[PDB]
Amino acid sequence: AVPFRRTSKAKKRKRRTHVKLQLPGMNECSNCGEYRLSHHVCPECGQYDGKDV
Amino acid sequence: NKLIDEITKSQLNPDVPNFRPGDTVRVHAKVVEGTRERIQLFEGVVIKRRGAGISETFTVRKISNSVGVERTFPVHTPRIAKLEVIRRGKVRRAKLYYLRNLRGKAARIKEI
Amino acid sequence: TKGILGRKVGMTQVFTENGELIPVTVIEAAQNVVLQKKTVETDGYEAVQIGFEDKRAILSNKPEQGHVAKANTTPKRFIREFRDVNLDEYEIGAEVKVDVFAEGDIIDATGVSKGKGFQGVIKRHGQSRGPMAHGSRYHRRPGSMGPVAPNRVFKNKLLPGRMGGEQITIQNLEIVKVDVEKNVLLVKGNVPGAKKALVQIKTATK
Amino acid sequence: MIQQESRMKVADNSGAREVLTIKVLGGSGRKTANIGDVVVCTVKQATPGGVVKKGEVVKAVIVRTKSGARRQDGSYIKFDENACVIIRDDKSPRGTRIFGPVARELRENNFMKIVSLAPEVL
Amino acid sequence: YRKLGRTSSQRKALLRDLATDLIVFERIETTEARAKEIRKVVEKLITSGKKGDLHARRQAAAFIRHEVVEVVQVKNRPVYALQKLFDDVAPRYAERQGGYTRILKKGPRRGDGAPMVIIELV
RNA sequence: UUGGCACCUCGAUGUCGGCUCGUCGCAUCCUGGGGCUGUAGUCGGUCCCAAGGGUUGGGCUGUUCGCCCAUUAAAGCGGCACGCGAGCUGGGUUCAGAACGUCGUGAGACAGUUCGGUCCCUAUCCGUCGCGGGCGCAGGAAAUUUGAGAGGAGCUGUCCUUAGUACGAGAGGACCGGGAUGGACACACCGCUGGUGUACCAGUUGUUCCGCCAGGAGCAUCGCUGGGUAGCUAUGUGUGGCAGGGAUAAACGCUGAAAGCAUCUAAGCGUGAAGCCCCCCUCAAGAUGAGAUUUCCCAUUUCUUCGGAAAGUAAGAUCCCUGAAAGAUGAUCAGGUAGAUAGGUUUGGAGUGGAAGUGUAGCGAUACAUGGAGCGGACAAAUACUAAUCGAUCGAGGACUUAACC
Ligand SMILES: CCC[C@@H]1C[C@@H](C(=O)N[C@@H]([C@H]2O[C@H](SC)[C@H](O)[C@@H](O)[C@H]2O)[C@@H](C)O)N(C)C1
Ligand SMILES: [Mg+2]
Ligand SMILES: [Mg+2]
Ligand SMILES: [Mg+2]
Ligand SMILES: [Mg+2]
Ligand SMILES: [Mg+2]
Ligand SMILES: [Mg+2]
Ligand SMILES: [Mg+2]
Ligand SMILES: [Mg+2]
Ligand SMILES: [Mg+2]
Ligand SMILES: [Mg+2]
Ligand SMILES: [Mg+2]
Ligand SMILES: [Mg+2]
Ligand SMILES: [Mg+2]
Ligand SMILES: [Mg+2]
Ligand SMILES: [Mg+2]
Ligand SMILES: [Mg+2]
Ligand SMILES: [Mg+2]
Ligand SMILES: [Mg+2]
Ligand SMILES: [Mg+2]
Ligand SMILES: [Mg+2]
Ligand SMILES: [Mg+2]
Ligand SMILES: [Mg+2]
Ligand SMILES: [Mg+2]
Ligand SMILES: [Mg+2]
Ligand SMILES: [Mg+2]
Ligand SMILES: [Mg+2]
Ligand SMILES: [Zn+2]
Structure with missing residues (x-):
């Protein structure tokens, strides 16, 4: 039910070793020349990097 | 499954006539009594026909000595010498389970 | 002792000559090749390594290609070792057909059971529920974790957790039919795993 | 599929009309009795002037059940x-x-006198 | 099939609403989970449209919403979503076996990070 | 156990019984082995070895206990805070109400009874069960594995035969051996029998809607009702505890002195338990003691006086994307156009049970025909129609010593 002891700084920091974000999966487009998520449409060009819209 | 169809195909009894739930059938069932094999007639209404291929079963209901008896058979069992359709019933559904709660007159199936 | 690898196709039923009706599992076992023979001199134990199903090149790597090239065969989906075999039988690259078994042969079927995921003690360990009424607030729970004295829980207090996907051996299944042109075994009763599951059929240890 | 407290019609000529199952015989923790199994039972309803009387503790063989029986032929x-x-x-x-x-x-369990007396054996 | 955080009746209403939106607007932005369910339902409506007969029209009518798409003018009569499905949309997929929709991934929505997509006819 | 003492706890160590979950001891209830018997046989008695497994469901009472009914091979006795209330119950007890008997002048009280009476808590740590990430394992990889070590399993009835033999005056009635078939328990699986099956099919009520009719839709527990696919399932089905081996316990012996005999013991040989160790099933090299086999990649560039460093890569892996046989999430497995991975489409299938429209008959409700029709989630096969585009990221260059070949 309740913490028996306060958690130390070290123990708190160890617990947070895995609380982090991953870098987004992205790459530079050819037509745009700017970064985009793979398998997404590129807004810089304004369409899907390959398939024109 | 196409491979299970191919493997079981040889065990499909082609002598099996066309019957539906509601039909009155006479099952000529082989019966191994003591030592010598015997034919016991079981005549009743087909209550249910379920499953596919070699696994297809049907159930025949009769009232024997004022007690409902249901007999369920594999369609392709070789322990059925002959299955003859005695009369074609006019019913409105595939499973005649409502017959289990009806006795005489109320349990009559109209013939086609 | 003979052995083969097949996929579970599914279950059906067959009428025996007697007239009895038996449930069977259909095991398809096409494309079993002998890949490697392990000896006491080289590996420390006798075993024959059998590769089962053919696999597209782009699904195989160079290490795999190099290992099946020794047996002049294509990459294989499943590779398993058989111990207690006679290595004098089995040439490297030889096919292993389902006619190594005969109708009436008693076999052991080994496979991975179906995955049920996270399961409670009622389904996973067959424990009893608490009462559902009479004021009970104890239905599908694991029971006392143990006595007080040892200020801790003993090491096989059964609890919820991931359920199936374990290796299982069913012992003493009768082979009911062997169809070589279809590479099919019919085994009386059921064997572990979903449809399409690897099944290792070998001669009964007993 | 008969257990302790299951009631059964008595399919015979003895006084008993209805029995209550006291015990399935043949095993320390045996839950259920099927066709051909012998149960110990008490007579709950009797026919006036019958041989077997109400409250009598008797053995009975189960001769038909709603839970029926599977046969080797798959029927x-x-x-x-x-x-x-x-x-x-x-x-x-x-x-x-x-x-x-x-x-x-x-007939298989060797209840031959019962089989002989029965109007139909299915 | 997906439960989309909805009861059975709520989910049928949602599918009918989105199916009609895609037939009427020909391109809509929605969540990925919704789009992956909509493609199944819209492609079956277009199949009905291609079948074209009264029985298929009435199967579609049981599903499509009674929405006015436009008012065309001969007198000016409204065009209903069902009419658009059988006269405009279906006929333009007469030589295409299936695959009447496509889903373009867009990016996460600000207020809830929901992965948004464009689903469009073609 | 009934007690004695008052040492921990009164800034709370919840107290009876039951439920759930067990685990341990052996002083053994059953099953196994054995000695003695006032052991003919069948049954027993008593003692020794033995803790592997097993050890029932009800009636009464809050009960524990106990008596009883019916079984069973047997219905063991104890410990674990009289095991287990941050796991449950709350009938009893130990609160406020009320009443009876009784005691008390009374307020009230009990070697007593009776009816009623708030059971809180989001898990920090260790522990337990599952599941990932990191690094290690003197190069980097992909598979296949050995098994130190661990866990699981371990129960038992009845019938037939041997044989109406042995034994017995009869009555009765075996050992040992051989067979069959159960109970309970476990594991797997859904072909069967059933269950469920809220995006399957049908019937049907009320009311609202789709302009009306017809045909449909909404809401009423999925409105209700009758069925039901995949999946998940037990009450369903298959299978298991087979048969062994080694060493032993109690015990029985052989040979055999000490002790010219005798003596199973001192030297030395054998027999001999459901028990021990194997055998069977599962996990297992973080087994840092980091094992083995097969196969793959190779010795790159620029720096660093030096040791070493960093930066492109190889084999290979990942991100990302389509998913399910997998799944809380990670993971696992199937795929990513070197394409059937999913959706669609086409053809099937199960399932439902005869669509709409039209026609015919009927005054009509309705019936019949067209036509096993129409519909048909999740099942099957084909088909590249839609989407798995395009990218990126990580990932060796192998220390020293000695010996042996060489
Ligand atoms: C014969 C009994 C002996 C005493 C019992 C215990 C005690 O006082 N328990 C409390 C408990 O009350 C609640 S349980 C309702 C509390 O949650 C629990 O922690 C705890 O305080 C109460 C029942 O009296 N003492 C330490 C010794
Ligand atoms: Mg699963
Ligand atoms: Mg229970
Ligand atoms: Mg509850
Ligand atoms: Mg401790
Ligand atoms: Mg509703
Ligand atoms: Mg003192
Ligand atoms: Mg304190
Ligand atoms: Mg002892
Ligand atoms: Mg009571
Ligand atoms: Mg206590
Ligand atoms: Mg308690
Ligand atoms: Mg506690
Ligand atoms: Mg007085
Ligand atoms: Mg009270
Ligand atoms: Mg909790
Ligand atoms: Mg924690
Ligand atoms: Mg260890
Ligand atoms: Mg089933
Ligand atoms: Mg079913
Ligand atoms: Mg209505
Ligand atoms: Mg109308
Ligand atoms: Mg309303
Ligand atoms: Mg001597
Ligand atoms: Mg020995
Ligand atoms: Mg035993
Ligand atoms: Mg496929
Ligand atoms: Zn671009």
Whole structure:
């Protein structure tokens, strides 16, 4: 039910070793020349990097 | 499954006539009594026909000595010498389970 | 002792000559090749390594290609070792057909059971529920974790957790039919795993 | 599929009309009795002037059940109700007549006198 | 099939609403889970449209919403979503076996990070 | 156990019985082995070895206990805070109400009874069960594995035969051996029998809607009702505890002195338990003691006086994307156009049970025909129609010593 002891700084920091974000999966487009998520449409060009819209 | 169809195909009894739930059938069932094999007639209404291929079963209901008896058979069992359709019933559904709660007159199936 | 690898196709039923009706599992076992023979001199134990199903090149790597090239065969989906075999039988690259078994042969079927995921003690360990009424607030729970004295829980207090996907051996299944042109075994009763599951059929240890 | 407290019609000529199952015989923790199994039972309803009387503790063989029986040929039999026949320690009925159909399983369990007396054996 | 955080009746209403939106607007932005369910339902409506007969029209009518798409003018009569499905949309997929929709991934929505997509006819 | 003492706890160590979950001891209830018997046989008695497994469901009472009914091979006795209330119950007890008997002048009280009476808590740590990430394992990889070590399993009835033999005056009635078939328990699986099956099919009520009719839709527990696919399932089905081996316990012996005999013991040989160790099933090299086999990649560039460093890569892996046989999430497995991975489409299938429209008959409700029709989630096969585009990221260059070949 309740913490028996306060958690130390070290123990708190160890617990947070895995609380982090991953870098987004992205790459530079050819037509745009700017970064985009793979398998997404590129807004810089304004369409899907390959398939024109 | 196409491979299970191919493997079981040889065990499909082609002598099996066309019957539906509601039909009155006479099952000529082989019966191994003591030592010598015997034919016991079981005549009743087909209550249910379920499953596919070699696994297809049907159930025949009769009232024997004022007690409902249901007999369920594999369609392709070789322990059925002959299955003859005695009369074609006019019913409105595939499973005649409502017959289990009806006795005489109320349990009559109209013939086609 | 003979052995083969097949996929579970599914279950059906067959009428025996007697007239009895038996449930069977259909095991398809096409494309079993002998890949490697392990000896006491080289590996420390006798075993024959059998590769089962053919696999597209782009699904195989160079290490795999190099290992099946020794047996002049294509990459294989499943590779398993058989111990207690006679290595004098089995040439490297030889096919292993389902006619190594005969109708009436008693076999052991080994496979991975179906995955049920996270399961409670009622389904996973067959424990009893608490009462559902009479004021009970104890239905599908694991029971006392143990006595007080040892200020801790003993090491096989059964609890919820991931359920199936374990290796299982069913012992003493009768082979009911062997169809070589279809590479099919019919085994009386059921064997572990979903449809399409690897099944290792070998001669009964007993 | 008969257990302790299951009631059964008595398919015979003895006084008993209805029995209550006290015990399935043949095993320390045996839950359920099927066609051809012997149960110990008490008589709950009796026919006035019958041989077997109300409150009597008797043995009975189950001769038909709603939970029926599977047969080796892959066929099944199910009846519309659960009935039993009161027997002696030798498998003979206390009554002289058996009423209603009776399952062929009795012949295999060696209840021959019952099978002979039955109007139909399915 | 997906439960989309909705009861059975709520989910049928949602599918009918989105299916009609895609037939009427020909391109809509929605969540990925919704789009992956909509493609199944819209492609079956277009199949009905291609079948073209009264029985198929009435199967579609049981599903499509009674929405006015436009008012065309001969007198000015409204065009209903069902009419657009059988006269405009279906006929333009007469030589295309299936695959009447496509889903373009867009990016996460600000207020809830929901992965948004364009689903469009073609 | 009934007690004695008052040492921990009164800034709380919840107290009876039951439920759930067990685990341990052996002073053994059953099953196994054995000695003695006032052991003819069948049954027993008593003692020794033995803790592997097993050890029932009800009636009464809050009960524990106990008596009883019916079984069973047997219905063991104890410990674990009289095991287990941050796991449950709350009938009893130990609160406020009320009443009876009784005691008390009374307020009230009990070697007593009776009816009623708030059971809180989001898990920090260790522990337990599952599941990932990191690094290690003197190069980097992909598979296949050995098994130190661990866990699981371990129960038992009845019938037939041997044989109405042995034994017995009869009555009765075996050992040992051989067979069959159960109970309970476990594991797997859904072909069967059933259950469920809220995006399957049908019937049907009320009311609202789709302009009306017809045909449909909404809401009423999925409105209700009758069925039901995949999946998940037990009450369903298959299978298991087979048969062994080694060493032993109690015990029985052989040979055999000490002790010219005798003596199973001192030297030395054998027999001999459901028990021990194997055998069977599962996990297992973080087994840092980091094992083995097969196969793959190779010795790159620029720096660093030096040791070493960093930066492109190889084999290979990942991100990302389509998913399910997998799944809380990670993971696992199937795929990513070197394409059937999913959706669609086409053809099937199960399932439902005869669509709409039209026609015919009927005054009509309705019936019949067209036509096993129409519909048909999740099942099957084909088909590249839609989407798995395009990218990126990580990932060796192998220390020293000695010996042996060489
Ligand atoms: C014969 C009994 C002996 C005493 C019992 C215990 C005690 O006082 N328990 C409290 C408990 O009350 C609640 S349980 C309702 C509390 O949650 C629990 O922690 C705890 O305080 C109460 C029942 O009296 N003492 C330490 C010794
Ligand atoms: Mg699963
Ligand atoms: Mg229970
Ligand atoms: Mg509850
Ligand atoms: Mg401790
Ligand atoms: Mg509703
Ligand atoms: Mg003192
Ligand atoms: Mg304190
Ligand atoms: Mg002892
Ligand atoms: Mg009571
Ligand atoms: Mg206590
Ligand atoms: Mg308690
Ligand atoms: Mg506690
Ligand atoms: Mg007075
Ligand atoms: Mg009270
Ligand atoms: Mg909790
Ligand atoms: Mg924690
Ligand atoms: Mg260790
Ligand atoms: Mg089933
Ligand atoms: Mg089913
Ligand atoms: Mg309505
Ligand atoms: Mg109308
Ligand atoms: Mg309303
Ligand atoms: Mg001597
Ligand atoms: Mg020995
Ligand atoms: Mg045993
Ligand atoms: Mg496929
Ligand atoms: Zn671009």
